[PDB]
Design an enzyme around this catalytic site. Sequence first.
Site, mmCIF file in Angstrom:
data_model
loop_
_atom_site.group_PDB
_atom_site.id
_atom_site.type_symbol
_atom_site.label_atom_id
_atom_site.label_comp_id
_atom_site.label_asym_id
_atom_site.label_seq_id
_atom_site.Cartn_x
_atom_site.Cartn_y
_atom_site.Cartn_z
ATOM 1 N N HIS B 86 25.704 46.757 27.605
ATOM 2 C CA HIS B 86 27.014 46.921 26.997
ATOM 3 C C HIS B 86 27.149 48.379 26.572
ATOM 4 C CE1 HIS B 86 27.602 42.549 26.454
ATOM 5 N NE2 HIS B 86 26.352 42.466 26.033
ATOM 6 N N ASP B 89 33.743 52.261 24.405
ATOM 7 C CA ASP B 89 34.740 53.239 24.812
ATOM 8 C C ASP B 89 35.761 53.212 23.694
ATOM 9 O OD1 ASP B 89 37.149 54.366 25.839
ATOM 10 O OD2 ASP B 89 36.961 53.267 27.783
ATOM 11 N N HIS B 91 39.278 54.559 22.500
ATOM 12 C CA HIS B 91 40.471 55.278 22.920
ATOM 13 C C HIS B 91 40.833 56.401 21.920
ATOM 14 C CE1 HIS B 91 42.347 51.870 25.593
ATOM 15 N NE2 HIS B 91 41.120 52.167 25.982
ATOM 16 N N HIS B 126 36.650 49.344 23.196
ATOM 17 C CA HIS B 126 36.214 48.185 23.977
ATOM 18 C C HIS B 126 34.972 48.497 24.818
ATOM 19 C CE1 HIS B 126 37.853 49.683 27.899
ATOM 20 N NE2 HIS B 126 38.861 50.154 27.180
ATOM 21 N N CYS B 127 34.284 47.428 25.276
ATOM 22 C CA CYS B 127 33.099 47.610 26.127
ATOM 23 C C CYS B 127 33.611 48.004 27.522
ATOM 24 C CB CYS B 127 32.354 46.305 26.182
ATOM 25 S SG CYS B 127 30.766 46.455 27.001
ATOM 26 N N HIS B 137 33.877 42.145 30.713
ATOM 27 C CA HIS B 137 33.435 42.203 29.334
ATOM 28 C C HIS B 137 34.583 42.214 28.369
ATOM 29 C CE1 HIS B 137 28.977 43.487 29.667
ATOM 30 N NE2 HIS B 137 29.354 43.123 30.865
ATOM 31 N N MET B 142 34.963 41.541 24.215
ATOM 32 C CA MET B 142 34.491 42.839 23.745
ATOM 33 C C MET B 142 35.487 43.951 23.556
ATOM 34 S SD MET B 142 30.586 43.260 24.923
ATOM 35 C CE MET B 142 30.121 44.297 23.519
ATOM 36 N N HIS B 247 56.332 39.439 16.883
ATOM 37 C CA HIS B 247 57.508 39.134 16.109
ATOM 38 C C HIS B 247 57.097 38.345 14.931
ATOM 39 C CE1 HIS B 247 61.472 37.237 15.209
ATOM 40 N NE2 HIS B 247 60.825 36.088 15.245
ATOM 41 N N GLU B 271 63.179 43.393 15.596
ATOM 42 C CA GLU B 271 62.954 41.966 15.579
ATOM 43 C C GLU B 271 61.666 41.701 16.265
ATOM 44 O OE1 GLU B 271 65.839 39.638 18.094
ATOM 45 O OE2 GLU B 271 66.352 41.582 18.992
ATOM 46 N N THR B 272 61.415 42.412 17.375
ATOM 47 C CA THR B 272 60.225 42.136 18.197
ATOM 48 C C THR B 272 59.857 43.464 18.761
ATOM 49 O OG1 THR B 272 61.010 39.894 18.722
ATOM 50 C CG2 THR B 272 59.422 40.890 20.377
ATOM 51 N N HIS B 298 56.091 36.862 21.226
ATOM 52 C CA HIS B 298 57.323 36.175 21.528
ATOM 53 C C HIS B 298 57.615 35.817 22.981
ATOM 54 C CE1 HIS B 298 61.300 34.438 20.604
ATOM 55 N NE2 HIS B 298 61.134 34.642 19.305
#
Lengths: 331, 331, 331
Positions: B86, B89, B91, B126-127, B137, B142, B247, B271-272, B298
């Site tokens: 494993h 990473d 971002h 994340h992996c 993964h 992950m 939402h 709203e969303t 939603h």
Amino acid sequence: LSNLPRVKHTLVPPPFAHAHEQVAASGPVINEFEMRIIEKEVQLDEDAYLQAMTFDGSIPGPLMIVHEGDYVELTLINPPENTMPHNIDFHAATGALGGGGLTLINPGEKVVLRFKATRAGAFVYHCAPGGPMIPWHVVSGMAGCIMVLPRDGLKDHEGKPVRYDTVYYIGESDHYIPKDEDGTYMRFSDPSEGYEDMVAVMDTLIPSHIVFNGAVGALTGEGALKAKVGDNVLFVHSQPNRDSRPHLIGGHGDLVWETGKFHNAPERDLETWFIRGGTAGAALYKFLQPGVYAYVNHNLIEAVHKGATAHVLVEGEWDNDLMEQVVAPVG
Amino acid sequence: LSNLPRVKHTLVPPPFAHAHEQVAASGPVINEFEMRIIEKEVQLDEDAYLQAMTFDGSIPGPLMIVHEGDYVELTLINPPENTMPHNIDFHAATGALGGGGLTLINPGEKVVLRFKATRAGAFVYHCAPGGPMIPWHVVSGMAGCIMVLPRDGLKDHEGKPVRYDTVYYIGESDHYIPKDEDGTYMRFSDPSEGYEDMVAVMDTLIPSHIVFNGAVGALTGEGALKAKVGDNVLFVHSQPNRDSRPHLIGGHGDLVWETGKFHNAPERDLETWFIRGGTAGAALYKFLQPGVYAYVNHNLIEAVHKGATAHVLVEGEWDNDLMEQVVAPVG
Amino acid sequence: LSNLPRVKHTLVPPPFAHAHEQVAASGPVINEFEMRIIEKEVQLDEDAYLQAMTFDGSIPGPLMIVHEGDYVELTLINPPENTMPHNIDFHAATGALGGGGLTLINPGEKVVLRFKATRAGAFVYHCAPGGPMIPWHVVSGMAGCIMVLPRDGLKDHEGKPVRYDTVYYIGESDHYIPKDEDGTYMRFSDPSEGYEDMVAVMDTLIPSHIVFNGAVGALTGEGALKAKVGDNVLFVHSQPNRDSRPHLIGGHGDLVWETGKFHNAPERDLETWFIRGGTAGAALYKFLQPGVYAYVNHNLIEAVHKGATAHVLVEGEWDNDLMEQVVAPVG
Ligand SMILES: [Cu+2]
Ligand SMILES: [Cu+2]
Ligand SMILES: [Cu+2]
Ligand SMILES: [Cu+2]
Ligand SMILES: [Cu+2]
Ligand SMILES: [Cu+2]
Ligand SMILES: [Mg+2]
Ligand SMILES: [Mg+2]
Ligand SMILES: [Mg+2]
Ligand SMILES: [Mg+2]
Ligand SMILES: [Mg+2]
Ligand SMILES: [Mg+2]
Ligand SMILES: [Mg+2]
Ligand SMILES: [Mg+2]
Ligand SMILES: [Mg+2]
């Protein structure tokens, strides 16, 4: 118009961009472009082929670059060896279904369309002959992009001029290759033959392949993109039929116009942005570290299983202040 | 750096956030975090299980909170009882594939990665071990999030400081559990055993489950989130692999950074909103009315059939000026 | 409130909008609206029918228009011939699950809900009886939109007033009609009978139909929308359960609020914008050229195979400066 300068451009294949200037060095000009439609089978992956229909022999079609207020005169040629009618719809244009209602050409015909590029932005262009032919020709590969730069070049969210060193045009395309019950792909002798089977896959809305530059792996390995530390690269990203969510692994979007229209404020520091199906967006990034990067659609199944991955190899010196391995894998 | 303060943090499980201050009470610091990778089968729903691979035993992995300009030193441990390699990473980081190229650890190994959190925003981590392992993964569980707050705290679209009382980290994850022809789900003895069958489901791009906090109903009923009228709650929402459209039923997003990067202007009164697969976004809402609320993706099929629903129970006094039942159901 | 003016409105069917004023000609008022729930089978396409559940007999439900700060009192009627309970959830409202927790009415009952329209924007309203009934009633057709205009009318990104001549309410709806193995659609005697088969299709997340105004072709051919060159048309677009990416073929979005909330800056010159499932967005466009236009969801398979296409026929004079056919198809 007989009164404005004319510029004849030679298009280059994606992901590259023809020569141009960021700040127009002149007043409005008439930009002349020519493309030949090429129908041919293409290899999307090991054992997967598409009976493609392409603008100028590539998927995506080539990038055109002009400035806001210029005119664009496109000569479109449908050679006699082709099997069906085609046309072009420029999202950058106003009227006649983007030009599609003025450019329907059968095999053996040509047409020349002029339009004024009144709005700045990266825009999709695509074939749209009418009815069911519209989606089928696009997912067969008939789409590209035109980038209409502001006359005074790109500006950021405070009106500051920004400049790039290189444009890379990533054309992402979804395809719907029919499958046998075991998952293997079907092959056909021409586009028409595979139409009914392709529709059945289209109806599921699940692409078999989602690719950059027309094939799985086109821009990986030997086709990896190159850059140097310090380079400002503008990634112009089109998706004519389906959404994408671009991300540069190890990087960011310094300035991003995800809806692709340059007079709107770009967002900064993005990790992942969003290209609506039927549009082109653009992201500028300054490389800070050397090494391997990948540029992907961040549904990682679409990136890895379906093909939406490109690699970027970057030369330069590593900055331990930005990142450093403190304890290497050990145990 | 030997010269900057070091802060050791104790992570808490999602949807909660470890203790922190909105406005950094100091200059740049080196934030120390540790996570243990835990591979284990988890119950996604009644009769649906996943051979999961997790950061710190939860899905999503825990939320890390730091300030822009700080450094982050993450100690990642792959215990010897685990079955595969494993890595991580971020971002939020720059270079080496987000740190993934410096953190590949086999079972029995540890690694310590330092990176500078140069950009404010909520970001996915994340992996990403390489190739087909990257999506597998991640959809095995992950992924988590790190929120890099501006040093002077959150600001709205006019530069006004805004503050929250509580952060709730909603980690949404899509999973692809294989099914028998009758729709029932398959079970496996370990992750590797179910890999080929899981790929077949991944290829369809249709998740079997889409969940918050790792399971259907995790944050409903006894696990409902709590709040009081007047509370400003920041809902930080990650989705590492697939889009979502959050939402709050009965509420709104007062200030929303859907692309999750705090120096960009937030939008108001939504709203969303939309979380691109491969990113984290954030929405602040001040509760105005007591009662039951639900927070959902939603696409209501994803919310109800697939699992993307959480409940929020809010205490306080009702305001008849905002809403009132004039004529109760009658007939 | 006994102290504020009351306005009784007569709703008109989509895609049209009831009479209203862009700039409120008064102080806060209480807007009175009434809708009758109608359960009936509708023809989505040649050989495709839906056992629908509708607000006021249309899909989408009718557009309500009010101004920010007004109150809304909705009288909802569930006639005795209907088969199940229904309610209404206004995304424009605050509290009690948008009003859904105060409006559950069985066949033979009525209810009157009052709420204050505190936030400007176009918002979805939809049925949400609880649990699995929430997605099923919405994809059965139970959704519409309310547009809460700022009291001083729409403003652009610099605060300039903008005005439209016509509002067209495009309600896009995804449906999941069960299919026989050969692809033909199933028919049922009532909504309940087809529930289990419909769930199986919902679980795939692949709509059988995606339509505007409730049917394939509703707004094409004889139902094409009309306009004249120079008209500023506001296209208000809702999608209660699934994303869409609207585009006007041959046009643009001059000003677009894709998340639909009017105090946020609109983006300009868009080619294609994005409506998150569970929201309404709005785009203003001034027609510049006469002829046929189409307004589509730009996943062209959703537009053409699934039904998300409307046509607009525009009268007026052609401007050769914007576009001209230089060489007509020849060869
Ligand atoms: Cu074509
Ligand atoms: Cu188009
Ligand atoms: Cu892993
Ligand atoms: Cu990633
Ligand atoms: Cu209902
Ligand atoms: Cu809703
Ligand atoms: Mg040539
Ligand atoms: Mg085969
Ligand atoms: Mg910069
Ligand atoms: Mg621990
Ligand atoms: Mg079974
Ligand atoms: Mg507020
Ligand atoms: Mg009536
Ligand atoms: Mg049949
Ligand atoms: Mg204008």
